[PDB]
């Protein structure tokens, strides 16, 4: 049946995928032709942020549209026994629910990480009200399992011999699209890749091993990523394993793009590609940005963001205006013709910015007391307003001020030479910490 | 719900798989641990026959329980334009239908080859009345396509990146078993493997390449099965490609065995493993038997046959009594508590033989006029009674008589030295040819 429908929203989020990994973000070693095509057909954001440097909190910010620091989940959820924290369906109108109330059929394929209690799972995707829950974790994901049978995903009872998890998740996204082709749907495709431990089909690893050898010289893939290197992690840039895993994600995104064309849904479907936090040390490529996962330096919070909506969003555009994972909830609600019912949101509707509208300045905030990692040197809070970013560290207490425009690698601390800017950003950060009841860092007394 | 049900019947048939390929049949190069376990848990037949040396006719004999020569399909069905032959659902009560009438839910996963007209497909598995038709050919299978997307199987619209066809078919068998666990079912698992062109996942090919090298010396896999060898076919015994394809079949049979245990169906399920014709020249291993596919010599018609029915059939038994693919229809009907309604059958109920009963002698017959292959030297008819087998050839007209007990490789023709036995078998063969209206071979006038 033809006629106006509210547009499908497909949200594709990689796990721990760095800002410097995609071909569109300047990477020449990895191959992401499908994502680069999605980029040439959409708007690419160079200053997109996860609202936290770790899994659970960014996922919290997406499903609640609220500051992780306000929710009280600022660090990844560990195994059940190491935490009393979970996302409570009675405490938030989640994004899937707001879309349900706007006439959408809702689906999650894969990683939740908003409840690590599997005995009762009161805060699982089903309990939050997803119409379809497909291949979500059935136990603490931990170091992972990427090959059928998937030891972390009991609900994937059926599969083929040595089936790769990324390939499975992307096939389930295709079938979900086809089953639900006739009505508005929200599909949250929550990839386990590229979370350590790094695993990819041998032929893809062999391919990037040889490409590593061609780039660096004969034997270099064995020298740096041989049987010796058990987790395939190194200080060498260009990781054949992450490249092979990113090729499986990329080929998967191409299957979804193909399925949308075939089913006639491309013209009325919003496609977002995002990552929940910065690249992981010894695995990920955050380009020239400082540090990565678990740090509030740019490398831990800067993410690839591609938004495609054919004939609504101009193709092959680059947007430098800062945005965060808080912005998705109000953006999807505007596209769905919905209004937040009582629900308060800490993000802003991006649809006017996506349609070529002029940008508007707003302070952006982060808080990482590392309640789970206990990373004393990484414990910190941050405000960005304009090009200035202020980081407050709690162990070795200090302020760091960077001009991200002139110093995007955060290599020159300005706090001392620019005290009035420092004092002005400190006041915004302190006010925000009281507004959200920011959790004190876990340090000695 | 517990209580007596008629037993599930799972019929697993490989394409063009030779008598000498399985570990249980003496092969040390290939690895078939799951099938060898099925063998240690069932009855293994050393003198089992396909009723024809080619695909379509053997499949005809299975679904009709009638001599291929009586049906009028004695050679494989070519593409639509090269044939007016098809199996007509209005001319036979097919096996799936006889089981339906005995209270079974019926399923085919894969190859039919009983209709090559895809414009109308009047003689397809659905038209013959299978409740579930899964991954059947949507066009002439020809040289094949073993990797998703499967160019010969349009109904496999959904799949993962570079999914292997054998792995897919065996996963679909598992899900079929699970969906239908509560009621009696017949599953015809009709594998496309190991039909040329030989294709298998690289890691399995690499594995048997190295094993070939270990057996024959360094470089020998490249020497005989390198980039040079496009179809991976050779005169060398031990083919890394067929071994890798047979390992995928074997691992698949293990998944089915596992699924039956998990679902509690192993105690009330009959498992048959069979092959539709002898191993293919330049690909298959027919051990010491003469020739292979398209010949009525033992290599073209002798098949692996393992029947498992825990606590009804004695485990780890070897049965030397001759049986054929004609025997399946009446055997499955007896196990289903059914009686052929009007339908005439050319085979015999094996259930008394499977339960440890004494064997009974019966003449067995073949006719190959090669209406499709046009193989003038291979065109022939054959009778086996006891250990004596008489072959009649039409091009270079002659009788060949072999004592298969003392001469299983058919290397010593006895027709001249044993004229009275020859004349006696000639009379049975001629009578049978008139009984079934045997099609004259396609030769010059
Ligand atoms: Br219409
Ligand atoms: Br994590
Ligand atoms: Br540290
Ligand atoms: Br200043
Ligand atoms: Br202050
Ligand atoms: Br019961
Ligand atoms: Br054939
Ligand atoms: Br010949
Ligand atoms: Br004689
Ligand atoms: Br005669
Ligand atoms: Ca993550
Ligand atoms: Ca065959
Ligand atoms: Na807990
Ligand atoms: Na809720
Ligand atoms: Na696994
Ligand atoms: Na035809
Ligand atoms: Na019929
Ligand atoms: Na293919």
Automatic annotation (TrEMBL), chains A, B:
Family: Belongs to the sulfatase family.
Entry GO MF terms: arylsulfatase activity; metal ion binding
The species this protein was found in: Pedobacter yulinensis
PANTHER family linked to this entry: ARYLSULFATASE FAMILY MEMBER, ARYLSULFATASE G
Keyword terms, alphabetized: Calcium, Hydrolase, Metal-binding, Signal
Keyword Lyase applies: no
Source species taxonomy: Bacteria, Pseudomonadati, Bacteroidota, Sphingobacteriia, Sphingobacteriales
List of residues binding Ca(2+): 15-16, 55, 276-277
UniProt KW Metal-binding keyword: yes
Sulfatase N-terminal domain span: 7-337
Reported cofactor(s): Ca(2+)
InterPro entries the UniProt entry points to: Alkaline_phosphatase_core_sf, Sulfatase, Sulfatase_CS, Sulfatase_N
Protein name per UniProt: N-acetylgalactosamine-6-sulfatase
Gene3D superfamilies xrefs: 3.30.1120.10, Alkaline Phosphatase, subunit A
């Amino acid at each position: 049946m033809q006629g106006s429908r509210k547009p499908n929203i497909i949200f594709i989020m990689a796990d721990d995928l760095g800002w410097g990994e995609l071909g569109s973000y300047g990477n020449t070693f990895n191959e992401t032709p499908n994502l680069d095509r999605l980029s040439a057909q959409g708007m690419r954001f160079t200053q997109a942020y996860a609202a936290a440097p770790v899994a659970s909190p960014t996922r919290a910010s997406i499903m609640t549209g609220q500051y992780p620091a306000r929710v009280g989940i600022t660090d990844f959820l560990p195994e059940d026994e190491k935490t009393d924290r979970w996302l409570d369906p009675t405490k938030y109108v989640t994004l899937n629910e707001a879309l349900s109330a706007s006439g959408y059929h809702t689906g999650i394929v894969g990683k939740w990480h908003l409840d690590t209690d599997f005995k009762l799972n009161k805060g699982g995707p089903k309990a939050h009200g997803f119409n379809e829950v497909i291949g979500t974790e059935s136990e603490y994901i931990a170091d992972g399992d990427y090959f059928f049978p998937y030891s972390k995903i009991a609900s994937f009872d059926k599969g083929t011999a040595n089936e790769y998890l990324t390939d499975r998740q992307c096939a389930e996204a295709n079938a979900f699209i086809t089953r639900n082709r006739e009505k508005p749907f929200f599909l949250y495709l929550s990839l386990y890749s590229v979370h350590t431990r790094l695993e990819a089909p041998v032929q893809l690893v062999e391919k990037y091993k040889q490409k590593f050898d061609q780039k660096y010289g004969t034997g270099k893939a064995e020298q740096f990523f041989g049987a010796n290197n058990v987790r395939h992690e190194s200080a060498q840039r260009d990781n054949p394993w992450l490249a092979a895993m990113l090729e499986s994600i990329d080929t998967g995104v191409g299957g979804i793009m193909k399925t949308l064309r075939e089913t006639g849904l491309a013209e009325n479907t919003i496609i977002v590609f995002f990552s929940d936090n910065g690249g992981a040390g010894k695995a990920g490529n955050n380009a020239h940005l400082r540090a990565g996962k678990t740090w509030l330096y740019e490398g831990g919070i800067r993410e690839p963001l591609i938004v495609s909506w054919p004939g609504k969003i101009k193709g092959n555009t680059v947007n430098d205006n800062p945005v965060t994972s808080l912005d998705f909830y109000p953006t999807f609600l505007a596209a769905a013709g919905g209004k937040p019912t009582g629900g308060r949101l800490d993000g802003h509707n991006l649809m006017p910015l996506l349609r070529g509208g002029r940008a508007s300045g707003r302070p952006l905030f982060w808080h990482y007391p590392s309640e789970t990692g206990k990373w004393v040197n990484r414990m910190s809070s941050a405000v960005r307003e304009g090009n200035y970013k202020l980081l407050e560290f709690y162990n070795n207490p200090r302020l760091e001020l960077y001009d991200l425009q002139n110093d995007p690698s955060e290599s020159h601390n300005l706090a001392t030479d620019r005290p009035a800017e420092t004092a002005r950003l400190k006041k915004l950060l302190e006010d925000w910490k009281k507004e959200v009841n920011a959790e004190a860092p876990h340090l000695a007394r």
